[PDB]
Design a protein around this motif. Structure first.
Motif, PDB file in Angstrom:
ATOM      1  N   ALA A 197       0.893  -1.332  -0.066  1.00 30.06           N
ATOM      2  CA  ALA A 197      -0.016  -0.226   0.145  1.00 30.06           C
ATOM      3  C   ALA A 197       0.702   1.026  -0.018  1.00 30.06           C
ATOM      4  O   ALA A 197       0.554   2.414  -0.738  1.00 30.06           O
ATOM      5  CB  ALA A 197      -0.990  -0.004   1.247  1.00 30.06           C
ATOM      6  N   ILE A 198       1.809   1.325   0.631  1.00 24.66           N
ATOM      7  CA  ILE A 198       2.929   2.512   0.761  1.00 24.66           C
ATOM      8  C   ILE A 198       3.485   2.495  -0.737  1.00 24.66           C
ATOM      9  O   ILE A 198       3.304   3.567  -1.388  1.00 24.66           O
ATOM     10  CB  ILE A 198       4.177   2.142   1.550  1.00 24.66           C
ATOM     11  N   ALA A 199       3.635   1.417  -1.413  1.00 22.13           N
ATOM     12  CA  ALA A 199       4.318   1.377  -2.831  1.00 22.13           C
ATOM     13  C   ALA A 199       3.364   2.008  -3.649  1.00 22.13           C
ATOM     14  O   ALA A 199       3.749   3.213  -4.486  1.00 22.13           O
ATOM     15  CB  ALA A 199       4.707   0.104  -3.147  1.00 22.13           C
ATOM     16  N   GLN A 200       2.196   1.540  -3.680  1.00 17.06           N
ATOM     17  CA  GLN A 200       1.031   2.120  -4.523  1.00 17.06           C
ATOM     18  C   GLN A 200       0.798   3.478  -4.431  1.00 17.06           C
ATOM     19  O   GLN A 200       0.624   4.411  -5.439  1.00 17.06           O
ATOM     20  CB  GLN A 200      -0.278   1.423  -4.439  1.00 17.06           C
ATOM     21  N   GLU A 201       1.165   4.076  -3.273  1.00 13.87           N
ATOM     22  CA  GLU A 201       0.871   5.576  -2.917  1.00 13.87           C
ATOM     23  C   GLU A 201       2.040   6.476  -3.394  1.00 13.87           C
ATOM     24  O   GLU A 201       1.753   7.482  -3.878  1.00 13.87           O
ATOM     25  CB  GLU A 201       0.677   5.888  -1.182  1.00 13.87           C
ATOM     26  N   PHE A 202       3.143   5.861  -3.501  1.00 16.41           N
ATOM     27  CA  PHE A 202       4.270   6.514  -4.021  1.00 16.41           C
ATOM     28  C   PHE A 202       4.152   6.531  -5.403  1.00 16.41           C
ATOM     29  O   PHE A 202       4.570   7.371  -6.378  1.00 16.41           O
ATOM     30  CB  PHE A 202       5.696   6.005  -3.563  1.00 16.41           C
ATOM     31  N   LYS A 203       3.498   5.301  -6.093  1.00 12.56           N
ATOM     32  CA  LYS A 203       3.213   5.460  -7.464  1.00 12.56           C
ATOM     33  C   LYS A 203       2.660   6.484  -7.906  1.00 12.56           C
ATOM     34  O   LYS A 203       2.775   7.063  -9.008  1.00 12.56           O
ATOM     35  CB  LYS A 203       2.797   4.099  -7.900  1.00 12.56           C
ATOM     36  N   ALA A 204       1.424   6.963  -7.273  1.00 14.29           N
ATOM     37  CA  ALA A 204       0.562   7.868  -7.465  1.00 14.29           C
ATOM     38  C   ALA A 204       1.124   9.364  -7.103  1.00 14.29           C
ATOM     39  O   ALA A 204       1.240  10.351  -8.012  1.00 14.29           O
ATOM     40  CB  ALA A 204      -0.812   7.909  -6.449  1.00 14.29           C
ATOM     41  N   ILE A 205       2.225   9.714  -6.192  1.00  8.67           N
ATOM     42  CA  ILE A 205       2.876  10.609  -6.056  1.00  8.67           C
ATOM     43  C   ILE A 205       3.579  10.976  -7.529  1.00  8.67           C
ATOM     44  O   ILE A 205       3.773  12.083  -7.802  1.00  8.67           O
ATOM     45  CB  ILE A 205       3.965  10.489  -4.731  1.00  8.67           C
ATOM     46  N   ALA A 206       4.449  10.060  -7.891  1.00  5.99           N
ATOM     47  CA  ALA A 206       5.318  10.063  -8.990  1.00  5.99           C
ATOM     48  C   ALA A 206       4.472  10.474 -10.206  1.00  5.99           C
ATOM     49  O   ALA A 206       4.817  11.418 -10.924  1.00  5.99           O
ATOM     50  CB  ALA A 206       6.133   8.912  -9.212  1.00  5.99           C
ATOM     51  N   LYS A 207       3.149   9.988 -10.380  1.00  8.36           N
ATOM     52  CA  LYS A 207       2.479  10.436 -11.468  1.00  8.36           C
ATOM     53  C   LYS A 207       1.968  11.843 -11.248  1.00  8.36           C
ATOM     54  O   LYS A 207       1.712  12.597 -12.562  1.00  8.36           O
ATOM     55  CB  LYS A 207       1.006   9.505 -11.634  1.00  8.36           C
ATOM     56  N   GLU A 208       1.559  12.019 -10.181  1.00  3.72           N
ATOM     57  CA  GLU A 208       1.193  13.516 -10.043  1.00  3.72           C
ATOM     58  C   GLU A 208       2.307  14.724 -10.283  1.00  3.72           C
ATOM     59  O   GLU A 208       2.155  15.695 -10.991  1.00  3.72           O
ATOM     60  CB  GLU A 208       0.573  13.920  -8.667  1.00  3.72           C
ATOM     61  N   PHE A 209       3.671  14.247  -9.894  1.00  7.16           N
ATOM     62  CA  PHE A 209       4.700  15.206 -10.023  1.00  7.16           C
ATOM     63  C   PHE A 209       5.040  15.110 -11.607  1.00  7.16           C
ATOM     64  O   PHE A 209       5.692  16.166 -12.001  1.00  7.16           O
ATOM     65  CB  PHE A 209       5.798  14.764  -9.201  1.00  7.16           C
ATOM     66  N   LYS A 210       4.730  13.998 -12.415  1.00  3.44           N
ATOM     67  CA  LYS A 210       5.237  14.133 -13.831  1.00  3.44           C
ATOM     68  C   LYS A 210       4.124  15.019 -14.383  1.00  3.44           C
ATOM     69  O   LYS A 210       4.778  15.710 -15.626  1.00  3.44           O
ATOM     70  CB  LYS A 210       4.998  12.959 -14.202  1.00  3.44           C
ATOM     71  N   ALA A 211       3.099  15.133 -14.116  1.00  2.00           N
ATOM     72  CA  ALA A 211       1.825  16.189 -14.571  1.00  2.00           C
ATOM     73  C   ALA A 211       2.329  17.561 -14.260  1.00  2.00           C
ATOM     74  O   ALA A 211       2.216  18.390 -14.995  1.00  2.00           O
ATOM     75  CB  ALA A 211       0.504  15.725 -14.311  1.00  2.00           C
ATOM     76  N   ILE A 212       2.827  17.885 -13.073  1.00  2.00           N
ATOM     77  CA  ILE A 212       3.236  19.115 -12.590  1.00  2.00           C
ATOM     78  C   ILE A 212       4.375  19.441 -13.411  1.00  2.00           C
ATOM     79  O   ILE A 212       4.626  20.669 -13.768  1.00  2.00           O
ATOM     80  CB  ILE A 212       3.420  19.081 -11.452  1.00  2.00           C
ATOM     81  N   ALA A 213       5.220  18.677 -13.915  1.00  2.00           N
ATOM     82  CA  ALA A 213       6.428  19.207 -14.880  1.00  2.00           C
ATOM     83  C   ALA A 213       5.892  19.413 -16.231  1.00  2.00           C
ATOM     84  O   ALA A 213       6.391  20.623 -16.424  1.00  2.00           O
ATOM     85  CB  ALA A 213       7.296  17.849 -14.976  1.00  2.00           C
ATOM     86  N   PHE A 214       5.057  18.626 -16.599  1.00  2.00           N
ATOM     87  CA  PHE A 214       4.478  19.129 -17.912  1.00  2.00           C
ATOM     88  C   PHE A 214       3.780  20.384 -17.797  1.00  2.00           C
ATOM     89  O   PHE A 214       4.058  21.365 -18.904  1.00  2.00           O
ATOM     90  CB  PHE A 214       3.564  18.120 -18.515  1.00  2.00           C
ATOM     91  N   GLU A 215       3.053  20.605 -16.758  1.00  2.00           N
ATOM     92  CA  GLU A 215       2.393  22.133 -16.562  1.00  2.00           C
ATOM     93  C   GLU A 215       3.373  23.294 -16.354  1.00  2.00           C
ATOM     94  O   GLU A 215       3.038  24.304 -17.430  1.00  2.00           O
ATOM     95  CB  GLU A 215       1.423  21.891 -15.394  1.00  2.00           C
ATOM     96  N   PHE A 216       4.474  23.057 -15.701  1.00  2.00           N
ATOM     97  CA  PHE A 216       5.290  24.262 -15.516  1.00  2.00           C
ATOM     98  C   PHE A 216       5.762  24.461 -16.845  1.00  2.00           C
ATOM     99  O   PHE A 216       6.022  25.468 -17.225  1.00  2.00           O
ATOM    100  CB  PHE A 216       6.171  23.980 -14.447  1.00  2.00           C
ATOM    101  N   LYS A 217       6.273  23.387 -17.517  1.00  2.00           N
ATOM    102  CA  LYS A 217       7.095  23.741 -18.896  1.00  2.00           C
ATOM    103  C   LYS A 217       6.176  24.349 -19.863  1.00  2.00           C
ATOM    104  O   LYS A 217       6.442  25.062 -20.775  1.00  2.00           O
ATOM    105  CB  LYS A 217       7.515  22.250 -19.235  1.00  2.00           C
ATOM    106  N   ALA A 218       4.815  23.872 -19.795  1.00  2.01           N
ATOM    107  CA  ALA A 218       3.900  24.548 -20.784  1.00  2.01           C
ATOM    108  C   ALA A 218       3.621  26.011 -20.299  1.00  2.01           C
ATOM    109  O   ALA A 218       3.612  26.794 -21.310  1.00  2.01           O
ATOM    110  CB  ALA A 218       2.490  23.672 -20.521  1.00  2.01           C
ATOM    111  N   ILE A 219       3.691  26.265 -19.142  1.00  2.52           N
ATOM    112  CA  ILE A 219       3.745  27.669 -18.834  1.00  2.52           C
ATOM    113  C   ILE A 219       4.967  28.389 -19.091  1.00  2.52           C
ATOM    114  O   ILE A 219       4.848  29.538 -19.759  1.00  2.52           O
ATOM    115  CB  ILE A 219       3.474  27.884 -17.314  1.00  2.52           C
ATOM    116  N   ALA A 220       6.174  27.647 -19.096  1.00  2.00           N
ATOM    117  CA  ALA A 220       7.365  28.405 -19.428  1.00  2.00           C
ATOM    118  C   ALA A 220       7.524  28.457 -20.843  1.00  2.00           C
ATOM    119  O   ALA A 220       8.435  29.274 -21.440  1.00  2.00           O
ATOM    120  CB  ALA A 220       8.527  27.419 -18.880  1.00  2.00           C
ATOM    121  N   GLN A 221       6.649  27.780 -21.735  1.00  2.00           N
ATOM    122  CA  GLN A 221       6.648  27.966 -23.252  1.00  2.00           C
ATOM    123  C   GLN A 221       5.661  29.039 -23.779  1.00  2.00           C
ATOM    124  O   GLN A 221       4.858  29.011 -24.507  1.00  2.00           O
ATOM    125  CB  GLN A 221       6.180  26.649 -23.666  1.00  2.00           C
ATOM    126  N   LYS A 222       5.865  30.362 -22.933  1.00  2.00           N
ATOM    127  CA  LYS A 222       5.092  31.303 -23.108  1.00  2.00           C
ATOM    128  C   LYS A 222       6.025  32.661 -23.218  1.00  2.00           C
ATOM    129  O   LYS A 222       5.945  33.401 -23.979  1.00  2.00           O
ATOM    130  CB  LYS A 222       3.933  31.187 -22.317  1.00  2.00           C
TER     131      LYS A 222
END
Lengths: 29, 29, 29, 29, 29, 29
Positions: F4-29
């Motif tokens: 259960a711990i492992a699954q929760e870190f799997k979701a954290i990683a997925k959320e930080f990967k979207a945050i990376a895309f989001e900031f770069k998208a902002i930075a592409q402006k």
């Protein structure tokens, strides 16, 4: 430097993905 | 694997330290 | 408003540094 | 030794909650 | 995108809150 | 519950990967 922020979160995500594999590997015991 | 968990969290702390400085520079003009 | 974000990531890095130190002393058997 | 880790993740969650609240008031224009 | 950043950090805080409780249960026997 | 711990870190990683895309998208402006 938002490009730089974004790259840093990209690395965070990569590190948490390895942590997930690691704990599950432990849990598979 | 516990040893590998430790180095990963050390690498995460480093990334978050660098992010903080960055945001501190956007906030400071 | 970004200052508060900057300070909060600084506190997060402080916490992951301590977590890393803890798992290392755990992995030290 | 896991207790200290437990408390430290509790403090990390407290900090990400505040970060979320801050970006929302930022996205509120 | 700032609005999307906010909901993602809200989801992260939630995950870290759940992790803390978990570790608190491994530490408590 | 380490699974259960492992699954929760799997979701954290997925959320930080979207945050990376989001900031770069902002930075592409």
């Amino acid at each position: 430097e938002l490009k730089a922020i974004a790259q840093e979160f990209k690395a965070i995500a990569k590190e948490f993905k390895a942590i997930a594999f690691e704990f599950k590997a432990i849990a598979q015991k």
